[PDB]
DNA sequence: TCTCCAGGCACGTGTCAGATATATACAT
DNA sequence: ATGTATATATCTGACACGTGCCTGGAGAC
């Protein structure tokens, strides 16, 4: 299956090791993936069923 | 001032693992070679490629011979027989050297004095790699 | 007298198509300077008893044990590759008195002493009846051999320089070899 | 007493390991010779 | 100053030791910045 | 090419031949690399030469000159040092001659001294002894040795006299010779002159 | 300046023993015309945080997770067995910075980062950078490459040995 | 000048026989080789060194060859 | 709840850090 | 006249590793 970024639905190149969300470029890792609240991850990964 | 990576010690074991299809055209006859090196206050187990083992068996080493694997160029030197075993039962005008001090894996500093013409010659006619 | 080098050349031998004139004159200079080297060799003479030779399937790898004896001393040994290659030549039949030079690697069969009765009649062997040697099996000896500087230059020049001793394929040996040979 | 006694009052080299597996053998004795092949 | 005129008489190797003699390896290989260890030619 | 330029291992040849049915004719070609002239010429890495180690110090050269005839005489020899690393590299010289040697100093454990003296006094095959000046030169029974080698033991004549008396004791059944090696034109000349004037001062009074 | 060839030979430079005078002059002429090609390649350059490699008893299959970071972002990568074989070769430890060519597997260690407890700063920006490299080359370099009698080493050992003209019309037409 | 002792002729029977005490871990422990020779008004079988059989295998020698 | 074996606890021996001592020439 | 400098030489002194063992954590129902 093709990997995709969970923030934008784009093509995912990088997966963050702290919380296991794939992302496309640097700035979504800066102001979305890093400062996200705990518990947002579980229905963030519910779309692809990775929880 | 050149640093060198040196694996030296007395060869304890020498066990090559074979390939699944040795006559497949491509690939090597063997997969890896397990070498057990033991020096003073240290003992290491070495898993090699075929390529370093070609140079190692080019020197005709065996069990009980101390070797000197220079990891810079892959060149190896048969240091001699060990004097932990017997001495007076050889016909091969051999020389006997004790166990190398320190651990097996080493990083030592050697001060070399070369010229630029030697660099030009060594790059013009390349020798000392482990290639064809 | 002997043991002193004497290089006698004509004038026309300097001009060559493989060598420059200075290279030919440097070789003629270095052929005339001699190095006398002493060496400590061991002579092993005895009636051989059991020869065990272990060779691989292709015949490349060779190892084995050599059991030799004299009147007063029995001693087994271990064989290298060149030792087995020298023993394969001049066929030993386990009872011929041989003599081995340790530092020269020379194998000399002196003769047969056991006088074997049952023999396969395939060889034309008429080996001389020598006696089994007595006394010390291993004897130390100091020898001297003379070599000149050009020979050491050609030997240290490349991988197969000992053939270049005789073929003359020593093409313009570099100056680094010559100064390192002078230092050594 | 044992501590006081302990504190007061208390060859031929081996040969090289010969190894030969999967290796054809030639024996040469006084009366017979052998050629063990594979 | 006593440490340097007495054992120069005994042996020159008491100050600096004779190291291994090898050609200069004109090579950029994989070195280490420090139940077996893999040794691959690089 | 790489299989041409080297050999297959023997156990690998056995596994391919009889455990896989591959005949000898269909083996890959092997062992086409030429033999070198010596075992010395097989590689360009040269180890530190032991002969260059011993010949660069002339005191060790004279010691090895006398030690051959000392071993041919069937003798027992003591050598006294002052410096500990010269007391550590003499084993590198003795392994070249494969002589039977023991080492004794004050850094060693105390209970090794008693059975070291015991195997000195019973085992006759031991040849070489390494000692410190104040460790083995004080009151130790060395009655079966006569030749004491003073490598650099000239720093104080009292310790030299004590080391002499440690070996030159009662019960010796033969003659005693003491050799003292030194180099000329050095600071050892003035140091030995100071030791000689201290010896004359001690001998007069 | 740069990017334009400048051959500087003397009058005595062409009297060779293995190359004719016209051959040496043709090589000196074709050494002084450049071909400028701009090509783009993706590269991964960053600071390695931690390498975890697990293997079986016989080492039939090797699974590896490599976490790698920049000053701006970090990621975890799952590696196949070939890239594990390319990482234990040319040993990469924690705190080292490397550049990875994903297509060719060329991993070069640029050194160590600022973690002592050589030295080179941690790379910034995006991990996967699209670099366009402007390559320049001489026609004499392509002549020995397209000629099959000698390899590229004749550019370095100087043993091209009288390149024929039929390859020269081919490289001119190309 | 040299004197050469030679054997030549057709191969009528060639078999290497095992020794009376076969060594363990090996197959075909040969003690000697019996090779029969046949020429014009001449026929002789003879004993042989066991190492010659390796050269026999190297030479591809069978019955009917010279 | 039955089984069972090796993980952690307990008790020995070697191995690098401090302390006194020689010691003699040089500099203050 | 005296500190000292820099290596000894002994020489203890506090600390980490190589064997027993037993019992409780893990596999199975």
SS (H, E, C) chain B: CEEEEEEEEEEEEEEEEECCCCCCCCCCCEEEEEEEEEECCEEEEEEECHHHHHHHHHCCCCCCEEEEEECCCCCEEEEEEECCCCCCCCCCCCCEECCCCCCCEEEEEECCCCCHHHHHHHHHCCCCCCCC
Q: How far is CA C79 from the centre of its chain?
A: 16
Q: Rounded CA gap, B92 and B73, in Å? A: 29
Which residues on neighbouring strands pair with residue G61, listed in sequence order?
none
Residue G13 C-beta-side C-alpha neighbours within 13 Å: 10
Euclidean distance between CA atoms G111 and G92, whole angstroms: 10
Kindly state whether D10 is in contact with chain F, defined as any CB-CB distance less than 8 angstroms: yes
Contacting residues 152-171/F vs strand J (CB within 7 A): none
Cβ pair C78:B90 closer than 8 A: yes
Measured between alpha carbons, how far is B67 from B62 in angstroms, rounded to an integer?
A: 10
* Two structure tokens written together for G29: 């002429």
Distances in Å between the Cα of F129 and the Cα atoms of E7, F78, F117 are 21, 5, 11
Q: Which two tokens stand for residue B11?
A: 């060869």
What three-state secondary structure class fits F158? helix
User: Which is nearest to H9 in space by CA: H48, H63, H55, H51?
Assistant: H63
**Residues in contact with G45: Cβ distance below 8 Å, sequence separation at least 6, in sequence order:** G97, G98, G99, G100, G110, G123, G127, G129
Please give, rounded to a whole number of angstroms, the shortest distance from the CA of G89 to a CA of chain E.
6
| The pair of three-digit structure tokens given for residue A24, joined into one six-digit string | 């496309």
Scan for tokens 């004499």, then name that residue.
Answer: G140
Q: How many helices (H) and strands (E) does chain G have?
A: 5, 6
Q: Which residues pair with C97 in a beta bridge?
A: C47, C111
Residue nearest to nucleotide J7 (CA to C1'): E3
The DSSP line for chain H is ---------EEEEEEEEEPSSPPTT-EEEEEEEEEEEEETTEEEEEEE-TTHHHHHHHHT--TT--
Q: How far is the CA of F104 from the C1' of J15 (A)?
A: 26
DSSP state of D15: P
Q: Do E9 and F85 touch (CB under 8 A)?
A: no
Residue A28 is classified by DSSP as: H
d(CA A24, CA A6) in angstroms, rounded, equals: 9
Residue A4 DSSP code: B
Q: How many other CB atoms are there within 10 angstroms of residue F133's CB atom?
A: 19
User: Which nucleotide is at minimal CA–C1' distance from E1?
Assistant: J6
The pair phi, psi for residue F198, each rounded to 5°, is -70, -35
Q: What does C148-171 look like in DSSP terms, one character per residue?
A: EHHHHHHHHHSTTHHHHHHH----
At residue C133, φ and ψ (nearest 5 deg) are: -70, 150
Token pair listed for C153: 């230059």
Token match 């006698």: residue? C8
Q: Beta strand D24-28 with C34-55: parallel, antiparallel or unpaired? A: antiparallel
Helix or strand (DSSP H, E) at A23: strand A22-23
Asked if C126 has any chain B CB less than 8 Å from its own CB, the reply is no
Please list every residue in chain C whose beta carbon sits closer than 8 Å to the beta carbon of residue B60.
81
Q: Does C175 touch chain F (CB under 8 A)?
A: no
3-state secondary structure of C68: strand
Query: Nearest Cα to C45, choosing from C157, C177, C173, C133?
Result: C133
Is residue G65 within 8 Å of G40, Cβ to Cβ? no
Q: Please tell me the distance from the alpha carbon of residue G96 to that of residue C79, in angstroms, as a whole number.
A: 50
Chain F, 110-129: which CBs lie within 7 Å of strand J? 110
Residue with tokens 């693992």: B17
**CA gyration radius for chain A?**
10
The Cα–Cα gap between C7 and C32 comes to: 6
- SS3 label, residue C78: strand
Burial D7-36 (b: 16+ CB within 10 A, else e): eeeeeeeeebeeebebbbbbbbeeeebbbb
Q: Please, are residues E27 and B132 in contact by the beta-carbon 8 Å criterion?
A: no
Tokens representing A6?
């969970």
Task: Assess contact for C48 and C96: CB atoms under 8 A.
Answer: yes
Q: Taking CB atoms and an 8 Å cutoff, what residues of chain B touch C83? A: 91-92
Token code pair at residue F15? 């596994």
Phi, psi values for residue B99, rounded to 5°: -70, 140
Q: Could you please report the per-residue DSSP string of G17-31?
A: SSS-HHHHHHHHHHT
- Chain B contacts of C66, Cβ < 8 Å? 91
CA-CA-CA-CA torsion sign (G135, G137, G141, G147): positive
Pairing of strands C74-79, C62-69: antiparallel
In terms of Cα–Cα distance, which of F61, F77, F63 is closest to F128? F77
Q: Buried (b) or exposed (e) across A14-45, using 16+ Cβ within 10 A?
A: bbbbeeebbbbbbebbeebbeeeeeeebeebb
Return all residues near A30 (Cβ < 8 A) that are at least 6 apart: G72, G73
| Token digits of residue G114 | 């600022």
Tokens 């050598």 belong to residue? F79
Chain F nearest-CA residue for D38: F18
Contact G126 A26 (CB under 8 A): yes
Classify burial at C67, counting beta carbons within 10 Å of its beta carbon; exposed 0-12, middle 13-18, buried 19 or more: middle
Q: How far is CA G39 from CA F10, G135, G171, in A?
A: 51, 7, 20
CB contact under 8 A, H23 and D34: yes
Does E38 reach chain G within 8 Å, measured CB to CB?
Answer: yes
Between strands F178-180 and G128-138, the pairing is unpaired
Cα separation, G102 vs B76, in Å, equals 33
The answer to whether C120 contacts H48, with C-beta atoms less than 8 Å apart, is yes
Nearest to F6 by CA among F30, F26, F27: F30
Asked if D29 and C94 come within 8 Å (Cβ–Cβ), the reply is yes
DSSP letter (8 states) at residue G69: E
DSSP F36-99: PSSSSTT-S-BPPPHHHHHHTSHHHHHHHHHHHHHHHHT--EEEEES-TTHHHHHHHHHHHTT-
Grouping H, G, I as helix, E, B as strand and the rest as coil, residue G98 is strand
Return the closest-CA partner of residue F96 out of F55, F137, F125, F59.
F55
Three-class secondary structure of residue F22 per DSSP? coil
Burial (0-12, 13-18, 19+ Cβ within 10 Å), B96:
middle
Contact F89 E13 (CB under 8 A): yes
Would you call F179 helix, strand, or coil by DSSP? strand
Nearest residue in F to C56, CA atom? F10
- Protein-to-nucleotide distance from the CA of G65 to the C1' of I7, whole angstroms: 30
Residue C78's DSSP bridge partners are C65
Instruction: Report d(CA B22, CA B26) in Å as an integer.
Output: 9
Q: At D6, which helix (H) or strand (E)?
A: helix D2-9
Considering only CA atoms, which of B64, F31, H27 is closest in space to residue D25? H27
- Asked if C122 lies within 8 A of H48 by C-beta distance, the reply is yes
Please state the separation of Cα B2 from the chain's center in Å: 19
Enter the DSSP assignment of F29: P
Do H and C touch (≥3 CB pairs < 8 Å)? Answer: yes
Query: Using CA atoms, how far apart are residues B12 and B7, in angstroms rounded to an integer?
Result: 14
- Closest to F79 (Cα-Cα) out of F91, C105, F69: F91
Distance in angstroms (rounded) separating the CA atoms of residues B60 and B80: 11
How are beta strands D33-37 and D24-28 bridged, if at all? Answer: antiparallel
Please tell me the distance from the alpha carbon of residue B87 to that of residue G34, in angstroms, as a whole number.
67
Asked if F106 CB < 7 A from strand J, the reply is: yes
Token couple for C25: 């004159």
CB G126: neighbour CB atoms within 10 A? 19
- Nearest-5° angle of CA G37, CA G43, CA G47? 145
User: Residues near D27 by Cβ (< 8 Å), separated by ≥ 6?
Assistant: C50, C51, C52, D33, D34, D35, D36
Q: Is E27 on the interface with G (CB under 8 A)?
A: no
Chain mean position to CA F140: 22
Alpha helix locations (H) across E1-42? 7-10
- The approach used to solve this structure was cryo-EM
Name the phi and psi angles at G26, rounded to 5. Answer: -65, -40
What distance in Å separates the CA atoms of residue B127 and residue B75, rounded to the nearest whole number? 11
Of chain F residues 156-195, which have a CB less than 8 A from chain D? none
> How distant is the alpha carbon of residue C174 from its chain centre?
28
Q: How far is CA H54 from CA B26, C123, D32, F24, F62, in A?
A: 31, 17, 18, 12, 57
Residue among E6, E12, E19, E41 with most chain F CBs within 10 A, to mutate? E6
Burial class (CB in 10 A: 0-12, 13-18, 19+), C85: middle
The H or E element spanning position C52 is strand C34-55
CA angle A11, A16, A19 (to 5 degrees): 120
Provide, as residue numbers in chain D, all residues whose Cβ is less than 8 Å from the Cβ of C118.
Answer: 31
D19 touching chain B per CB within 8 A: yes
Tokens read off for B63: 């069990």
CA pair distance G114, B27, nearest whole angstrom: 42
Q: Which residues touch strand I (CB under 7 A)?
A: E 1-2; F 109, 155-156, 159, 194
Q: What angle do CA H8, H12, H18 make, to 5 degrees?
A: 100
Dist. CA C45–CA F123, nearest whole Å:
33
E32 CA to I2 C1' in angstroms comes to 53
**F contacts of B70 (beta carbons < 8 Å):** 45
For residue A11, list its beta bridge partners.
A4
Question: HSE of C153 in the Cβ direction (CA atoms, 13 Å)?
Answer: 25
CA pair distance B124, B69, nearest whole angstrom: 25
Smallest Cβ–Cβ distance between F13 and the set C57, C155, C162 belongs to C57
**Torsional sign, CA F41, B93, F125, C139:** negative
Yes or no, beta carbons of A26 and G73 under 8 Å apart: yes
In this complex, which of D24, D26, D27 lies closest to C57 when CB atoms are compared? D24
Cα–Cα distance measured from residue F180 to residue F159, given in angstroms and rounded to the nearest whole number: 14
Indicate the DSSP class of residue C132.
P
d(CA G21, CA E8): 62
CA nearest to G157 within chain B: B124
| Run of H or E including F133 | none
Interface residue F12 vs chain B (CB under 8 A): yes
Residue of G17, G10, G11, G22 lying closest to G158 (CA atoms): G17
Residue H10 in tokens: 């057709």
Chains in touch with G (≥3 Cβ pairs < 8 A)? A, B, E
Looking at the DSSP assignment, which residues form a beta bridge with residue F178?
A: F148
C1’ J22 / CA E35, Å: 29
H4 touches C at CB < 8 Å: no
Integer Rg of chain B from CA: 17
Which of G87, G91, G115 to mutate: most E Cβ within 10 Å? G91
Q: CA-based angle G158:G163:G164, to the nearest 5? A: 175
- How many angstroms separate the CA atoms of D34 and H53, rounded? 12
**Number of A:G CB contacts under 8 A?**
27
Q: What is the DSSP letter of A29?
A: I
Structure tokens at F29: 């070609």
Cα(C7)–Cα(C26) distance, integer angstroms: 12
Nucleotide nearest F83, CA–C1', reads J8
- Chain F residues with a Cβ under 8 Å from any Cβ in chain C: 7-10, 13-14, 17, 24, 27, 30-31, 34, 36-37
| B127 lies within 8 A of chain G by CB | no
């Amino acid at each position: 299956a093709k990997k995709y970024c969970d923030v934008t639905g784009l093509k995912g190149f990088y997966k963050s090791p702290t919380n296991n969300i794939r992302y496309h470029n640097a700035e979504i890792y800066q102001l979305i993936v890093k400062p996200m609240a705990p518990g947002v991850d579980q229905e963030y990964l519910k779309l692809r069923g990775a929880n | 001032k050149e640093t060198k990576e040196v694996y030296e010690g007395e060869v304890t074991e020498l066990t090559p693992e074979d390939a699944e299809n040795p006559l497949g055209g491509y690939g090597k006859t063997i997969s890896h070679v397990i070498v057990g090196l033991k020096s003073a206050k240290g003992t290491k187990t070495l898993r090699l490629d075929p390529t370093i083992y070609e140079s190692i068996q080019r020197e005709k080493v065996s069990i009980g011979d101390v070797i000197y694997i220079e990891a810079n160029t892959g060149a190896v030197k048969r240091v001699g027989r060990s004097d932990a075993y017997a001495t007076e039962f050889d016909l091969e005008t051999e020389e006997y050297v004790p166990l190398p001090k320190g651990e097996v894996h080493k990083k030592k500093e050697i001060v070399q004095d070369v010229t630029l013409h030697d660099l030009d010659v060594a790059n013009a006619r390349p020798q000392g790699g482990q290639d064809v | 007298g002997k043991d002193v080098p004497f290089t006698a050349i004509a004038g026309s031998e300097i001009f060559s198509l493989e060598l420059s004139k200075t290279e030919a004159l440097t070789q003629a200079f270095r052929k005339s300077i001699g190095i006398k080297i002493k060496e400590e060799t061991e002579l092993i003479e005895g009636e051989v008893v059991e020869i065990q030779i272990d060779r691989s399937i292709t015949g490349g790898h060779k190892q084995g044990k050599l059991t030799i004896k004299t009147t007063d001393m029995e001693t087994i040994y271990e064989l290298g590759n060149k030792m087995i290659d020298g023993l394969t030549k001049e066929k030993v039949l386990a009872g011929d008195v041989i003599s081995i030079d340790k530092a020269s690697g020379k194998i000399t069969k002196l003769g047969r002493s056991f006088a074997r009765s049952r023999d396969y009649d395939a060889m034309g062997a008429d080996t001389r009846f020598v006696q089994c040697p007595e006394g010390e099996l291993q004897k130390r000896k100091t020898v001297v051999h003379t070599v000149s500087l050009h020979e050491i230059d050609v030997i240290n020049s490349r991988t197969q320089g000992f053939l270049a001793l005789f073929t003359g394929d020593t093409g313009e040996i570099r100056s680094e070899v010559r100064d390192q040979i002078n230092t050594k | 007493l044992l501590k006081k006694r302990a504190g007061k009052s208390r060859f031929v080299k081996p040969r090289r390991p010969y190894n030969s597996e999967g290796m054809t053998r030639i024996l040469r004795r006084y009366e017979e010779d052998l050629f063990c092949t594979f | 100053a006593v440490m340097q005129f007495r054992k120069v008489c005994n042996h020159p190797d008491l100050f600096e030791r004779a190291d291994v003699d090898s050609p200069f390896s004109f090579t950029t290989f994989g070195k280490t910045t420090s139940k077996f260890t893999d040794l691959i030619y690089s | 090419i790489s299989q041409a330029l080297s050999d297959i291992p023997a156990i690998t040849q056995y596994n391919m031949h009889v455990k896989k049915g591959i005949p000898v004719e269909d083996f890959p070609k092997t062992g086409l690399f030429p033999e070198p002239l010596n075992k010395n010429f097989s590689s360009n890495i040269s180890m530190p030469s032991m002969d260059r180690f011993i010949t660069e110090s002339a005191k060790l050269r004279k010691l090895d000159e006398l030690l051959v005839k000392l071993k041919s005489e069937g003798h027992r020899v003591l050598i006294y040092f002052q410096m500990t690393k010269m007391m550590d590299l003499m084993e590198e010289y003795l392994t070249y001659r494969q002589y039977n040697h023991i080492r004794l100093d004050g850094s060693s454990k105390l209970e090794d001294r008693r059975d070291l003296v015991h195997d000195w006094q019973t085992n006759p095959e031991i040849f070489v002894f390494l000692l410190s000046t104040r460790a083995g030169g004080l009151g130790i029974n060395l009655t079966a040795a006569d030749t004491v080698i003073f490598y650099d033991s000239d720093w104080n004549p009292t310790i030299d006299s004590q080391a002499m008396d440690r070996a030159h004791r009662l019960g010796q059944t033969r003659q005693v010779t003491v050799y003292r090696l030194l180099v000329r034109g050095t600071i050892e000349e003035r140091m030995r002159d100071r030791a000689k004037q201290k010896e004359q001062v001690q001998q007069v009074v």
